[PDB]
Amino acid sequence: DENIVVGPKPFYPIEEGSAGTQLRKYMERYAKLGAIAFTNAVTGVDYSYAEYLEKSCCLGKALQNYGLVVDGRIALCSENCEEFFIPVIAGLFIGVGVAPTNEIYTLRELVHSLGISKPTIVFSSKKGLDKVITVQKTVTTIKTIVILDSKVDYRGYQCLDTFIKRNTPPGFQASSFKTVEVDRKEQVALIMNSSGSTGLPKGVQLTHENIVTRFSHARDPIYGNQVSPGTAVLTVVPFHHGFGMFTTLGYLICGFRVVMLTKFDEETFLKTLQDYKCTSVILVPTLFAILNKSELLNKYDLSNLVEIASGGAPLSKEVGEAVARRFNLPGVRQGYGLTETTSAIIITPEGDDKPGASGKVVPLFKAKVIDLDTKKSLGPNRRGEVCVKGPMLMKGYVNNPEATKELIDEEGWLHTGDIGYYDEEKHFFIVDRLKSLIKYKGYQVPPAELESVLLQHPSIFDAGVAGVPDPVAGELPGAVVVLESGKNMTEKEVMDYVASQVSNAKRLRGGVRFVDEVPKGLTGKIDGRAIREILKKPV
Numbered sequence: 001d002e003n004i005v006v007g008p009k010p011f012y013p014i015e016e017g018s019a020g021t022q023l024r025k026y027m028e029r030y031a032k033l034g035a036i037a038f039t040n041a042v043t044g045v046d047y048s049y050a051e052y053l054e055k056s057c058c059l060g061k062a063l064q065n066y067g068l069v070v071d072g073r074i075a076l077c078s079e080n081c082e083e084f085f086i087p088v089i090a091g092l093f094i095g096v097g098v099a100p101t102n103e104i105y106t107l108r109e110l111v112h113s114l115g116i117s118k119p120t121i122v123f124s125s126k127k128g129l130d131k132v133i134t135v136q137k138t139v140t141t142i143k144t145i146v147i148l149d150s151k152v153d154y155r156g157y158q159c160l161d162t163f164i165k166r167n168t169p170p171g172f173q174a175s176s177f178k179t180v181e182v183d184r185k186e187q188v189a190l191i192m193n194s195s196g197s198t199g200l201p202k203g204v205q206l207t208h209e210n211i212v213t214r215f216s217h218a219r220d221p222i223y224g225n226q227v228s229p230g231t232a233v234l235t236v237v238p239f240h241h242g243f244g245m246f247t248t249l250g251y252l253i254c255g256f257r258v259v260m261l262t263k264f265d266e267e268t269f270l271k272t273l274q275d276y277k278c279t280s281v282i283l284v285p286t287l288f289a290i291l292n293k294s295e296l297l298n299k300y301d302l303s304n305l306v307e308i309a310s311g312g313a314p315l316s317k318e319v320g321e322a323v324a325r326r327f328n329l330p331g332v333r334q335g336y337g338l339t340e341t342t343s344a345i346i347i348t349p350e351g352d353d354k355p356g357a358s359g360k361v362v363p364l365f366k367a368k369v370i371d372l373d374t375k376k377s378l379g380p381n382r383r384g385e386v387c388v389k390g391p392m393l394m395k396g397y398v399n400n401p402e403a404t405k406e407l408i409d410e411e412g413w414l415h416t417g418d419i420g421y422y423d424e425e426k427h428f429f430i431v432d433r434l435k436s437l438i439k440y441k442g443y444q445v446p447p448a449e450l451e452s453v454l455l456q457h458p459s460i461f462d463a464g465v466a467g468v469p470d471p472v473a474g475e476l477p478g479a480v481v482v483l484e485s486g487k488n489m490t491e492k493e494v495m496d497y498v499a500s501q502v503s504n505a506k507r508l509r510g511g512v513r514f515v516d517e518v519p520k521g522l523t524g525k526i527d528g529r530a531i532r533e534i535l536k537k538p539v
């Protein structure tokens, strides 16, 4: 089938050994250089590769002495912090699966998520502690809670350093620790949760094989970033999620200084880019607005920044192009993937930007676009459902064989639930989620297309689009808008603006509501259910 698109051979073949073995190999190399692994942008605290490796090795030994066996389970519940990856790396080192969650989960989400992954130990931030304690009342198999981001015991709980001390012999030599080899294709490494799900979280089982494939991509000269000493990357993406998880672990393989930024006011963002001499930034679409509108770019030395990348949700072509222009870059680097595919499976190749494209199929992967009804493959410039196949496909959902079967078909293809197409040169374009399409008469209107028009208006800060039920037409496109501070538009002004830029079918017949915040998930995907509720309210 000439409709199947096949990625090229990786520059660097997948290395032998587990994901833990590969992380140890590379982290050790950078430790001996005296390189910095993590930096908290706002406090300036650094962890060297040496320190980070040592603590991860020591925690690995501590977890074994505690009694965890291969295929045991631990979790994190934490907002981004520079310590986040210590339990991740320790777990990869010893073959104990790690279930990352964020302090920002609701209690309903967290009780469900940890109820699935069943961690013996939870590494909680101080901020997340109350939620973890509450969850433990239901998930009573959680034996131990350790405080991730404290140097001292906190509210009666052992901090990370105390847990290590209490579970390793005095004088223990970290240098003596050995990574545990595992059955690479079968051994669960991580249990992840998607963001912006319409249901409760499912546990996505990712293996060592999945991760070591990502490591080949991350170092790839075309599909990743080249190793270069102590180079700094600014990251704003949630670590507990696949997007932050696998960009960050890839950066550690590459020896980068990971500059973690948790505050998004414009001055902090730009001061961080400048002060840490960041060469790359990895963003969610919302933050492009800041850069496009900023009047302060000129006040900072931003000359080190040579790559701006996006992922997680649709990025307006025109907003991306404007920001790339401001920074005198060819284009925005993009990646598209799902939690269930580990990381990005379509990535902008270096030297192969195409306006609007999400990129090309990554090495070792294949992709196709299928007809929404027949499920047969399509040629170029034909919209349908994107499907992918390759060694980053998850092992399956935890204890949910029905959901696994719905996602990955009898021929091994993962159905992404996303509409897109590829062009004659095989660049893929991702339009929106199938479940998000607005069924106006016989049309299927993608909210992202309307959101892009709205985000181009200089008086609009943010917007989200969803369908309002209608007896005659089925659904009407409607919008929630956050106005820029000091600017005003009426509902009619917004509607008329949109009507001037779009086809008849795409008009905002469902109306416009003004709000302080557009409901979005943790990686920027629009919360349609929440938008529909706002639109329904008499205002």
Ligand SMILES: Nc1ncnc2c1ncn2[C@@H]1O[C@H](COP(=O)(O)O)[C@@H](O)[C@H]1O
Binding pocket: 193, 194, 195, 196, 242, 310, 311, 312, 313, 314, 315, 334, 335, 336, 337, 338, 339, 340, 358, 416, 417, 418, 430, 431, 432, 433, 523, 525
């Ligand atoms: N570059 C991208 N452009 C458009 N949508 C994206 C992109 N990357 C991720 N997504 C969306 O995010 C979904 C995966 O979200 P998650 O389940 O949280 O991993 C995909 O199915 C897409 O709908």
Ligand SMILES: O=C1CSC(c2nc3ccc(O)cc3s2)=N1
Binding pocket: 242, 243, 246, 247, 309, 310, 311, 312, 333, 334, 335, 336, 337, 338, 339, 342, 343, 344, 523
């Ligand atoms: O929804 C998801 C799950 S993993 C992922 C991404 N991973 C990435 C890696 C690099 C990149 O540039 C862009 C992306 S998006 N997006």
